[PDB]
Design a protein around this ligand. Structure first.
Ligand SMILES: Nc1ncnc2c1ncn2[C@@H]1O[C@H](COP(=O)(O)OP(=O)(O)O)[C@@H](O)[C@H]1O
Length: 320
């Protein structure tokens, strides 16, 4: 009890470079740990956990990354949240997530930005100093063909060569590729009033053009994220209020939102175009702004429990 297991692990982790979570059973309950931050998207969470279990059981090729995934579906429904959460659970921190925006690698000479200029990179140096990391490639269809070839090398041998010719090890990484292809086209067809078979057939040809079977066969799983239900959005709202409540808890102030108040923020904080991205500024504008005035005015004080309900002209604040 005096010297804990984390005490020993942190010594070993410092000398070896292996993260504490890897050194320290918990893979059996990996899905419930990811669900603490990621609401819904059960299929994506199952797929990720299953792949990680195959790797650790010694069932997969050792000369490859831990796992590789393609995440399809719309914007703002949990793709990045899962990647960040995966990094925190597996590698102890969100700093262990490396993000590559492929919109910045569309113009031919972008390969030198990835692996470094010729004798005359961002990804290579990043992974060199963090072997244990989650790498997120966003908007993968935007990538230049030559840039796309470098990604296939990582999938094929779990390593990568840079400018000098020296290798960078990718065997301890998790690769997540994300794309939005098809989702805007569906919204276009629904607004234009196309029948279903029109929308369905047009999505498959667009996916066919960009994602060929030679590429997809290298991946562990292809997962399509779905839009969030009204129930699930209410859970996001409750998660997003966490930091505010912790700030208010220092002055012993409670925020009891009524059921209609959560629906108010949920209706404005979510839409099919941007997903739940607008929610942060909706909370800031509709809740945090008028609450700040109440506190500054002297209506809300130390120890007061506040009821948040909805009338016309936005949210109303009441005290017992
Ligand atoms: N499944 C989810 N679980 C928890 N929060 C979510 C979920 N989906 C969306 N959000 C919230 O909405 C925001 C959407 O951003 P993000 O997930 O980064 O979008 P994308 O996945 O398109 O990159 C997040 O910051 C998060 O707070």
């Amino acid at each position: 009890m005096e010297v804990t297991e984390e005490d020993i692990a942190e010594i070993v982790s410092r000398w070896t470079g292996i993260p504490v979570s890897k050194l320290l059973e918990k893979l059996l309950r990996l899905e419930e740990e990811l669900h603490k931050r990621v609401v819904g998207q059960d299929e994506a969470i199952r797929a990720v956990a299953d792949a990680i279990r195959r790797a650790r059981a010694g069932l997969k090729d050792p000369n490859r990354p831990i796992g590789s995934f393609l995440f399809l579906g719309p914007t703002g429904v949990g793709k990045t949240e899962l990647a960040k959460t995966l990094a925190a659970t597996l590698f102890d921190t969100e700093e262990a997530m490396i993000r590559i925006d492929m919109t910045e690698y569309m113009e031919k000479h972008a390969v030198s930005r990835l692996i470094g200029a010729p004798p005359g990179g961002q990804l290579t140096e990043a992974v060199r100093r963090r072997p244990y990391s989650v790498i997120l490639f966003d908007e993968i269809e935007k990538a230049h063909p030559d840039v796309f070839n470098i990604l296939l090398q990582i999938l094929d041998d779990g390593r990568l060569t840079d400018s000098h010719g020296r290798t960078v090890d990718f065997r301890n990484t998790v690769i997540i590729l994300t794309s939005n292809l098809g989702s805007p086209l569906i919204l276009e067809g629904l607004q234009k009033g196309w029948p279903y078979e029109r929308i369905r057939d047009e999505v498959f040809k667009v996916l066919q053009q960009h994602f060929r079977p030679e590429f997809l066969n290298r991946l562990d799983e292809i997962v399509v994220f779905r839009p969030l239900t009204k129930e699930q959005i209410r859970q996001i709202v409750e998660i997003q209020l966490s930091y505010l409540r912790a700030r208010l808890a220092e002055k012993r102030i409670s925020l009891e939102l009524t059921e209609a108040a959560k629906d108010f923020l949920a209706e404005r904080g979510y839409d099919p175009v941007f997903g739940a991205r607008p929610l942060r500024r909706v909370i800031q504008r509709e809740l945090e702004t008028p609450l700040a005035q109440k506190i500054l005015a002297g209506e809300v004080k130390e120890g007061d429990r506040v009821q948040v309900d909805v009338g016309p002209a936005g949210l109303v604040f009441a005290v017992p």
